[PDB]
Amino acid sequence: NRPNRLIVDEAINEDNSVVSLSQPKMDELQLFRGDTVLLKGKKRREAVCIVLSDDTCSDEKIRMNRVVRNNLRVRLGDVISIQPCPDVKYGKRIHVLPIDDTVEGITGNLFEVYLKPYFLEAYRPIRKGDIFLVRGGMRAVEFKVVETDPSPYCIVAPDTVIHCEGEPIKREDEEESLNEVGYDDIGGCRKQLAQIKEMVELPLRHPALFKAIGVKPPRGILLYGPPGTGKTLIARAVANETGAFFFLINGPEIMSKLAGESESNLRKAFEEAEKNAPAIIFIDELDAIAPKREKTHGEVERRIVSQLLTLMDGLKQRAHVIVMAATNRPNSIDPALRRFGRFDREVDIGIPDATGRLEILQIHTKNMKLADDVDLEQVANETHGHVGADLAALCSEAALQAIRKKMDLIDLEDETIDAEVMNSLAVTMDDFRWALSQSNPSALRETVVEVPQVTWEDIGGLEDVKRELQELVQYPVEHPDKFLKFGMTPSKGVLFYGPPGCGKTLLAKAIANECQANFISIKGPELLTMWFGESEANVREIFDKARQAAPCVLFFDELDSIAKARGGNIGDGGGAADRVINQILTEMDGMSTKKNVFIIGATNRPDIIDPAILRPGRLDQLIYIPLPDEKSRVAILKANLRKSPVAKDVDLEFLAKMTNGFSGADLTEICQRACKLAIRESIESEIRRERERQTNPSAMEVEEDDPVPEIRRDHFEEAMRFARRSVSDNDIRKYEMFAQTL
Amino acid sequence: ANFISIKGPELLTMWFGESEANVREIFDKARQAAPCVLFFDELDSIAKARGGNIGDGGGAADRVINQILTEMDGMSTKKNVFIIGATNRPDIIDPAILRPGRLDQLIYIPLPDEKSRVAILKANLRKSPVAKDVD
């Protein structure tokens, strides 16, 4: 498009990049060997381009390939202007240190072998620590320098005596890992990261713009959840592109045999570094700093808090020392920094999403090519609950399971493993799916325990109700287009007036297993404690967990036990329980109307539950349920029998006909009684056979294995005769009146 | 003005006993926030038809009814305490006040009759996605 806007293409010459200046480029600034025409690189980077080109036959355009950028370690977005470097000078003394990777491997004297390939045709620019690959030998000649005074490195001359230092340097080995400042773990918070970068670098790089606008640098923020789940990862990525280092927030500094002066020393060191270069504050979570003297004051604690507030307020306004603040739990945040003047501006904490999930999955795949059939988009959409490094942990678990299977089926490998097997250790989409199904959210792991999973199909009846629930679960979540077209938010749903004893808990568990999403279910003993305000804390924790793991339905038990009004049980615990219930309702009526905040309620009969907050202004929306049926009873009985060893002679039709007025628990009980009778018969037959074998050792192997592999119709009839129904007409009337109370 | 938007069974079916408790609470709120228009809407819901004339429950219900009558017969006479109740029937909520017994002037604020349901549904459909032929 333009002579300056170069295109990217593979060069037709031997080099993979066409490093050849155009007529204007080679006329305005010609690159020469004697005059180092260093490009406008990042962080004072100097590079030289030597690519063969035939300009006499045809005119070629400048091409910037990826190989040149990788070799020079120059990031995109910076204009590379080749101009003579006047800041490059010779050093007073060059103390070349022996590189351990280069010293170990060279036959004979290390100096002679190193100087043999370093005397001429070095094919590397004059810069210390420059990543230059040497063609031939399969060993890059890393010119490690102990200390270079002039520019990045001194001129390569033999006029300086090389002295071997008493101690080595591991910067070359550490930079390989330290360079891993990937934005892939910052997927979703790109806007916040860009704002932070602008407020940090550009504001420090262009203080005149800040002076003209009149706004100084802000205090900053961090990410909640684990470090590396958004906090340590962000900190390390920022530090990788940081001028002066920050100081980690370890409270143990002043906490010593000294007088606590370590805080003052830290402030002084921060001032010295900020004067030296643009430094930051490696602020830990808000809890690490102070609760704002909420729990206790603490003599040294209050002194340190005051000193920190003084340093933050009377900061080096002239030096514009960018003290990076954080964002942990707001309760952990002290008010002084939360107030303007101590901390300039504190921002929120980032959160994960499906796009960030895809980014983290891309990072993990870049770490190692696990599978060739894994649908990263499908997993990320499925992985709604996983946040932060949880996705990476799940990927590692999938790799571990797949590798365990492959090795155990391959070889114990107590000494060594097959290199063919090692190269053939790729993970599978099936392995990833199996681990993910085994996997669960990190917060839920600290939150809830497992339960017996069942299939929504495995439970029969309420097909319309099941369809409505599934639609509410998916079309409001799995379809954002449905939300856009409708606009109506999902209904809360108050309490399914379901079967009294068969358990709406069964339906809830089957749905949650079928739902494959965050699900909240607790009992009434959850919050009541001999700790003042403990119930309110429990409610707040539940709400915060739901907000973190939305969408989730609160299948809270003790619905009647919480729905009862303030009066009646005079005087309960002086109303403190009523106060907690009211707060929770206000915390939930009353909850955050976003991210599909859902709840699930049910009772044997609604009459026990008082509609104090169950009104559809405090319960938002409502959803009731019916009692059992007869055809649905036959269906549920058929499902239960299908789950078990069925029989043909049993009159299931007449059983269903008699089963018009029963409950599903009653059918399960009849099945259990028949199974018990069958097991008793089998045990009796086995006892008779053993007695015969003992009395006559000839009848041991002359008996059928299953005397009744199917259910004896006689056994079923006897169980029915011994059985009774749990249907109560007065209870039916009460439940109907509660329904009639609508 | 910050009208005291009262609930339904929150003044008559008072949770602290008879209606007098919630009446006094509303009186204190209106005196501390005058003019707090005590919008005690849904008088039919406000009464909530407690009932239960058995043992002490009947005493509690009678006390609640008498306290409601007393509140309707003298309360915080400031802050414009207007109770726009729901009249399901002539005796559904406080028949004596429905008759010219408790309220000398039962001032019902009449509203112009509109197809406000139609307009609200139109606004909702505009907020959603329904168009073209709409009878």
PDB file of N, CA, C and O in Angstrom, chain A residues 595-626:
ATOM      1  N   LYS A 595     -26.867 -12.379  35.113  1.00  0.00           N
ATOM      2  CA  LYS A 595     -26.158 -13.650  34.969  1.00  0.00           C
ATOM      3  C   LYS A 595     -27.032 -14.843  35.341  1.00  0.00           C
ATOM      4  O   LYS A 595     -26.542 -15.836  35.885  1.00  0.00           O
ATOM      5  N   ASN A 596     -28.328 -14.750  35.045  1.00  0.00           N
ATOM      6  CA  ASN A 596     -29.265 -15.849  35.254  1.00  0.00           C
ATOM      7  C   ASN A 596     -29.225 -16.364  36.687  1.00  0.00           C
ATOM      8  O   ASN A 596     -29.057 -17.567  36.916  1.00  0.00           O
ATOM      9  N   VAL A 597     -29.369 -15.465  37.652  1.00  0.00           N
ATOM     10  CA  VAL A 597     -29.451 -15.843  39.056  1.00  0.00           C
ATOM     11  C   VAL A 597     -30.782 -16.561  39.253  1.00  0.00           C
ATOM     12  O   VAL A 597     -31.850 -15.959  39.111  1.00  0.00           O
ATOM     13  N   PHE A 598     -30.721 -17.852  39.571  1.00  0.00           N
ATOM     14  CA  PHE A 598     -31.911 -18.682  39.664  1.00  0.00           C
ATOM     15  C   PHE A 598     -31.960 -19.334  41.039  1.00  0.00           C
ATOM     16  O   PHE A 598     -30.958 -19.402  41.756  1.00  0.00           O
ATOM     17  N   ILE A 599     -33.147 -19.800  41.416  1.00  0.00           N
ATOM     18  CA  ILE A 599     -33.324 -20.521  42.669  1.00  0.00           C
ATOM     19  C   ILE A 599     -34.377 -21.598  42.466  1.00  0.00           C
ATOM     20  O   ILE A 599     -35.236 -21.485  41.585  1.00  0.00           O
ATOM     21  N   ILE A 600     -34.324 -22.645  43.282  1.00  0.00           N
ATOM     22  CA  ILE A 600     -35.246 -23.769  43.151  1.00  0.00           C
ATOM     23  C   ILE A 600     -35.833 -24.079  44.518  1.00  0.00           C
ATOM     24  O   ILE A 600     -35.099 -24.336  45.476  1.00  0.00           O
ATOM     25  N   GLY A 601     -37.158 -24.078  44.604  1.00  0.00           N
ATOM     26  CA  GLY A 601     -37.846 -24.353  45.847  1.00  0.00           C
ATOM     27  C   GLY A 601     -38.901 -25.425  45.669  1.00  0.00           C
ATOM     28  O   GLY A 601     -39.386 -25.666  44.561  1.00  0.00           O
ATOM     29  N   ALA A 602     -39.264 -26.062  46.780  1.00  0.00           N
ATOM     30  CA  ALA A 602     -40.302 -27.078  46.789  1.00  0.00           C
ATOM     31  C   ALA A 602     -40.702 -27.371  48.225  1.00  0.00           C
ATOM     32  O   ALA A 602     -39.934 -27.113  49.157  1.00  0.00           O
ATOM     33  N   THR A 603     -41.908 -27.901  48.396  1.00  0.00           N
ATOM     34  CA  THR A 603     -42.374 -28.362  49.692  1.00  0.00           C
ATOM     35  C   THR A 603     -43.365 -29.495  49.464  1.00  0.00           C
ATOM     36  O   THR A 603     -43.950 -29.627  48.385  1.00  0.00           O
ATOM     37  N   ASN A 604     -43.540 -30.327  50.491  1.00  0.00           N
ATOM     38  CA  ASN A 604     -44.557 -31.369  50.421  1.00  0.00           C
ATOM     39  C   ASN A 604     -45.941 -30.763  50.251  1.00  0.00           C
ATOM     40  O   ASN A 604     -46.740 -31.240  49.438  1.00  0.00           O
ATOM     41  N   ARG A 605     -46.229 -29.712  51.009  1.00  0.00           N
ATOM     42  CA  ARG A 605     -47.411 -28.889  50.813  1.00  0.00           C
ATOM     43  C   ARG A 605     -47.015 -27.442  51.047  1.00  0.00           C
ATOM     44  O   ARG A 605     -46.174 -27.155  51.909  1.00  0.00           O
ATOM     45  N   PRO A 606     -47.602 -26.503  50.301  1.00  0.00           N
ATOM     46  CA  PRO A 606     -47.223 -25.093  50.462  1.00  0.00           C
ATOM     47  C   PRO A 606     -47.755 -24.452  51.730  1.00  0.00           C
ATOM     48  O   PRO A 606     -47.218 -23.417  52.149  1.00  0.00           O
ATOM     49  N   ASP A 607     -48.779 -25.034  52.354  1.00  0.00           N
ATOM     50  CA  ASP A 607     -49.387 -24.438  53.535  1.00  0.00           C
ATOM     51  C   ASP A 607     -48.401 -24.278  54.681  1.00  0.00           C
ATOM     52  O   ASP A 607     -48.458 -23.268  55.391  1.00  0.00           O
ATOM     53  N   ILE A 608     -47.501 -25.242  54.871  1.00  0.00           N
ATOM     54  CA  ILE A 608     -46.476 -25.098  55.895  1.00  0.00           C
ATOM     55  C   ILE A 608     -45.606 -23.878  55.644  1.00  0.00           C
ATOM     56  O   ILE A 608     -45.183 -23.218  56.601  1.00  0.00           O
ATOM     57  N   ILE A 609     -45.344 -23.547  54.386  1.00  0.00           N
ATOM     58  CA  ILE A 609     -44.528 -22.397  54.025  1.00  0.00           C
ATOM     59  C   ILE A 609     -45.401 -21.155  54.071  1.00  0.00           C
ATOM     60  O   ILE A 609     -46.467 -21.111  53.444  1.00  0.00           O
ATOM     61  N   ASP A 610     -44.962 -20.152  54.818  1.00  0.00           N
ATOM     62  CA  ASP A 610     -45.664 -18.882  54.866  1.00  0.00           C
ATOM     63  C   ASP A 610     -45.143 -17.962  53.773  1.00  0.00           C
ATOM     64  O   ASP A 610     -43.937 -17.864  53.540  1.00  0.00           O
ATOM     65  N   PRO A 611     -46.033 -17.269  53.068  1.00  0.00           N
ATOM     66  CA  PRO A 611     -45.572 -16.418  51.963  1.00  0.00           C
ATOM     67  C   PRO A 611     -45.117 -15.047  52.427  1.00  0.00           C
ATOM     68  O   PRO A 611     -45.472 -14.030  51.823  1.00  0.00           O
ATOM     69  N   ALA A 612     -44.321 -15.009  53.494  1.00  0.00           N
ATOM     70  CA  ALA A 612     -43.772 -13.748  53.964  1.00  0.00           C
ATOM     71  C   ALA A 612     -42.859 -13.103  52.934  1.00  0.00           C
ATOM     72  O   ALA A 612     -43.064 -11.938  52.577  1.00  0.00           O
ATOM     73  N   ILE A 613     -41.875 -13.844  52.432  1.00  0.00           N
ATOM     74  CA  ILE A 613     -41.007 -13.357  51.369  1.00  0.00           C
ATOM     75  C   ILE A 613     -41.273 -14.190  50.125  1.00  0.00           C
ATOM     76  O   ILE A 613     -40.612 -14.023  49.095  1.00  0.00           O
ATOM     77  N   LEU A 614     -42.253 -15.088  50.212  1.00  0.00           N
ATOM     78  CA  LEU A 614     -42.604 -15.926  49.075  1.00  0.00           C
ATOM     79  C   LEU A 614     -43.607 -15.198  48.195  1.00  0.00           C
ATOM     80  O   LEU A 614     -44.113 -15.750  47.213  1.00  0.00           O
ATOM     81  N   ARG A 615     -43.894 -13.949  48.536  1.00  0.00           N
ATOM     82  CA  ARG A 615     -44.747 -13.123  47.703  1.00  0.00           C
ATOM     83  C   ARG A 615     -43.965 -12.778  46.446  1.00  0.00           C
ATOM     84  O   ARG A 615     -42.738 -12.629  46.504  1.00  0.00           O
ATOM     85  N   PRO A 616     -44.622 -12.641  45.298  1.00  0.00           N
ATOM     86  CA  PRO A 616     -43.856 -12.410  44.068  1.00  0.00           C
ATOM     87  C   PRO A 616     -43.414 -10.965  43.932  1.00  0.00           C
ATOM     88  O   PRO A 616     -43.466 -10.379  42.848  1.00  0.00           O
ATOM     89  N   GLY A 617     -42.960 -10.394  45.042  1.00  0.00           N
ATOM     90  CA  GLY A 617     -42.236  -9.144  45.046  1.00  0.00           C
ATOM     91  C   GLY A 617     -40.949  -9.367  45.804  1.00  0.00           C
ATOM     92  O   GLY A 617     -39.930  -8.718  45.554  1.00  0.00           O
ATOM     93  N   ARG A 618     -40.997 -10.322  46.729  1.00  0.00           N
ATOM     94  CA  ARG A 618     -39.837 -10.767  47.482  1.00  0.00           C
ATOM     95  C   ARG A 618     -39.384 -12.156  47.061  1.00  0.00           C
ATOM     96  O   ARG A 618     -38.229 -12.519  47.301  1.00  0.00           O
ATOM     97  N   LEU A 619     -40.272 -12.940  46.444  1.00  0.00           N
ATOM     98  CA  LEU A 619     -39.864 -14.194  45.828  1.00  0.00           C
ATOM     99  C   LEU A 619     -39.690 -14.033  44.326  1.00  0.00           C
ATOM    100  O   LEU A 619     -39.500 -15.034  43.625  1.00  0.00           O
ATOM    101  N   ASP A 620     -39.749 -12.799  43.825  1.00  0.00           N
ATOM    102  CA  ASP A 620     -39.691 -12.530  42.395  1.00  0.00           C
ATOM    103  C   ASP A 620     -40.778 -13.317  41.675  1.00  0.00           C
ATOM    104  O   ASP A 620     -41.937 -12.897  41.647  1.00  0.00           O
ATOM    105  N   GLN A 621     -40.419 -14.457  41.095  1.00  0.00           N
ATOM    106  CA  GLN A 621     -41.383 -15.308  40.414  1.00  0.00           C
ATOM    107  C   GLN A 621     -41.681 -16.553  41.240  1.00  0.00           C
ATOM    108  O   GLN A 621     -40.976 -16.871  42.201  1.00  0.00           O
ATOM    109  N   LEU A 622     -42.733 -17.265  40.847  1.00  0.00           N
ATOM    110  CA  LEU A 622     -43.207 -18.431  41.575  1.00  0.00           C
ATOM    111  C   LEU A 622     -43.469 -19.591  40.623  1.00  0.00           C
ATOM    112  O   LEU A 622     -43.852 -19.383  39.469  1.00  0.00           O
ATOM    113  N   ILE A 623     -43.245 -20.810  41.107  1.00  0.00           N
ATOM    114  CA  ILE A 623     -43.599 -22.011  40.359  1.00  0.00           C
ATOM    115  C   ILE A 623     -43.977 -23.129  41.321  1.00  0.00           C
ATOM    116  O   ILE A 623     -43.144 -23.588  42.106  1.00  0.00           O
ATOM    117  N   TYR A 624     -45.222 -23.591  41.250  1.00  0.00           N
ATOM    118  CA  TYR A 624     -45.725 -24.649  42.111  1.00  0.00           C
ATOM    119  C   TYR A 624     -45.623 -25.996  41.403  1.00  0.00           C
ATOM    120  O   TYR A 624     -45.042 -26.119  40.322  1.00  0.00           O
ATOM    121  N   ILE A 625     -46.197 -27.021  42.022  1.00  0.00           N
ATOM    122  CA  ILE A 625     -46.197 -28.352  41.420  1.00  0.00           C
ATOM    123  C   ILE A 625     -47.437 -29.122  41.848  1.00  0.00           C
ATOM    124  O   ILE A 625     -48.084 -28.763  42.844  1.00  0.00           O
ATOM    125  N   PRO A 626     -47.828 -30.156  41.101  1.00  0.00           N
ATOM    126  CA  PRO A 626     -48.948 -30.997  41.536  1.00  0.00           C
ATOM    127  C   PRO A 626     -48.501 -32.180  42.374  1.00  0.00           C
ATOM    128  O   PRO A 626     -47.316 -32.341  42.677  1.00  0.00           O
TER     129      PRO A 626
END
